[PDB]
Design an enzyme around this catalytic site. Sequence first.
Site, PDB file in Angstrom:
ATOM      1  N   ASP A  35      27.162 -75.119  74.161  1.00 10.76           N
ATOM      2  CA  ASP A  35      27.078 -75.293  75.605  1.00 10.76           C
ATOM      3  C   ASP A  35      28.313 -74.728  76.307  1.00 10.76           C
ATOM      4  OD1 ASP A  35      26.610 -76.097  78.154  1.00 10.76           O
ATOM      5  OD2 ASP A  35      26.978 -78.237  77.804  1.00 10.76           O
ATOM      6  N   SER A 199      28.209 -62.714  90.757  1.00  6.56           N
ATOM      7  CA  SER A 199      27.212 -61.659  90.700  1.00  6.56           C
ATOM      8  C   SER A 199      27.240 -60.864  91.998  1.00  6.56           C
ATOM      9  CB  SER A 199      25.834 -62.275  90.465  1.00  6.56           C
ATOM     10  OG  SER A 199      24.806 -61.317  90.527  1.00  6.56           O
TER      11      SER A 199
END
Length: 330
Positions: A35, A199
């Site tokens: 994770d 992004s």
Amino acid sequence: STGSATTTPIDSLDDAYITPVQIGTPAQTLNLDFDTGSSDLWVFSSETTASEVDGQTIYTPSKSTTAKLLSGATWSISYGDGSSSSGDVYTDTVSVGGLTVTGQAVESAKKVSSSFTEDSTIDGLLGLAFSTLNTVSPTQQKTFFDNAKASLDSPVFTADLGYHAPGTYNFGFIDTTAYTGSITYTAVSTKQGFWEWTSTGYAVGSGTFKSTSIDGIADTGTTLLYLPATVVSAYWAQVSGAKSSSSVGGYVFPCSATLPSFTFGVGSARIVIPGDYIDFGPISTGSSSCFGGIQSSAGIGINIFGDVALKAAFVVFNGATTPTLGFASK
Ligand SMILES: NCCCCCCC(=O)O
């Protein structure tokens, strides 16, 4: 040193991925959920409340000659999906894919919440976010990666998740045969303890690319792609009959639909998530309403590039002094 381990979807929907991890001496192999959105290595154990164990493999520290109680240390964690676990702590030898760390903090669960109990395929979590998020008190502990880093050939790990197929976690090297083209690297902020990056925009299907900054985290422990409501609405508007259902808890779509792809930007590069990756199947067995793999992050407080996005790429987690993230198509 290096390590290389195969990671395998737990079910037919790629809801999560499990990777075998050797703990203790002789080795006890547990299948852990790696994770990159948390920083605790915790396991089902001989100390876990019996009624909260249902099919998991447990770590038994009393059977490990290298286990030592980390006296006074406790841990307690709550995840974004509302699940939780807590317990005490041992140090022991932990190996992943041939890479060994001695003195790793292994957090032994005394209690786990229902969603952990109900998932027999996940024996615990191995956190790969920054050690500043580790929950052990009063002495915070280091992740497996942070402990391994100095021994690694290069201070990196890579995630290469499969779509409906196994993939690979590598430590200490970049497998140049595992991706196509070049890797585009992008800046990371560690201010919140995550692999947080920005992004450069998105496209829906064959539509034009929208240049817009989307800050979010690369999180292998989250199944879906969670993005701003504007972006998610623009995606689902291209699917006839798709709608957000408050009763179901997100966007659903007719199972008869063909889903468009979704592209996200990494610098000037583009990663394309095929439409099929966005299908999470019937909301309940036999239903003709299907659950979407792109959902709104509104109310979470952060955008999350979970498995839906990451599995479309070869992803480099560069843990050098100035950390960065790399993405390549594959
Ligand atoms: N960063 C993801 C946090 C939640 C992971 C939960 C995994 C599980 O239910 O086994």
